[PDB]
Ligand SMILES: CC(C)CC(CC(C)C)NC(=O)[C@@H]1CNC[C@H](N2CC(=O)N(c3ccccc3Cl)CC2(C)C)C1
């Protein structure tokens with residue numbers, strides 16, 4: 034592990050409080066793409082120009098064209114990323130990727146098959162996994178690992194900051210953290226094991242009456258997830274306590290009832306991380322004649338990683354998050 038002095042930052046744009054993306058450039062000359070940085074995965078991919086135009090999502094996004102890059106390096110082995118909410122498929126390619134000022138040769142997948150649902154709903158073009166190589170599909174070295182191999186980063190860590198206003202939309206600091214966006218001290222929790230940004234969660238409290246995860250649970254700290262999620266079983270009890278009713282994909286409460294929802298706390302490493310209704314309710318109205326969505330979904334992640342809760346933007350918006358790769362821990366601090 035070689036440590037330099039360079040720390041870099043990627044300015045993120047906030048889309049509806051659900052999607053936080055930044056720009057990266059691939060090839061020579063650079064072909065820019067909008068991508069989300071997902072600690073819940075380890076691969077990098079952008080839509081390919083070789084993607085059949087019958088995939089409308091490809092018609093509605095920036096396509097990487099290898100024929101215009103002089104740095105491109107062919108490989109072609111097939112690749113399929115099966116995410117929780119959808120799947121993408123294509124092949125592996127190599128070229129120079131610029132991110133936050135750093136130029137690194139990277140193996141990424143050129144997606145040639147990306148379904149309308151959910152990708153048509155995607156503001157971003159691709160994804161940059163910030164997970165360990167252990168979670169990488171196709172055994173492809175993660176872009177951060179490669180950057181660390183350059184020995185330019187001052188620290189073997191990166192931090193995320195998600196702003197509330199959908200000003201700066203968000204900010205990722207590679208090689209450290211930005212004290213401008215957090216106050217108080219960082220409080221760390223150790224990873225259940227290296228290879229996954231998952232930590233032990235001692236318990237989830239809702240208001241004063243209910244207590245979920247009383248025997249412990251797993252908490253994946255997911256920068257690529259918009260909401261906070263728990264096993265269907267957990268969310269049912271949780272939502273029961275909130276008085277919310279379940280629709281096809283999310284939960285909602287009559288907007289007038291929104292402001293009076295109880296607090297929800299997540300016990301992590303001996304520190305109570307609390308959210309208020311304003312933290313998880315999309316309060317777009319106060320009338321009883323309208324339904325307000327909750328930023329908490331139900332999602333059952335399969336073993337070996339699941340069952341587990343997922344702490345996404347809903348959580349990260351309030352708590353500045355630092356991902357420490359050298360000490361295999363995650364640190365939280367109050368965002369500002
Ligand atoms: C469950 C984990 C541990 C593994 C799994 C897959 C693995 C092969 C990495 N990881 C994930 O699924 C990722 C977990 N973190 C979130 C991530 N998002 C899913 C999603 O719904 N996205 C999205 C957001 C808004 C609009 C449209 C879309 Cl597509 C984008 C990404 C892919 C970043 C998938």
Ligand SMILES: *[C@@H]1O[C@H](CO)[C@@H](O)[C@H](O)[C@H]1NC(C)=O
Pocket residue numbers: 107108109110
């Ligand atoms: C793709 O890269 C792998 C190494 O990661 C290599 O073994 C393989 O031959 C490459 N694909 C080809 C045939 O270009």
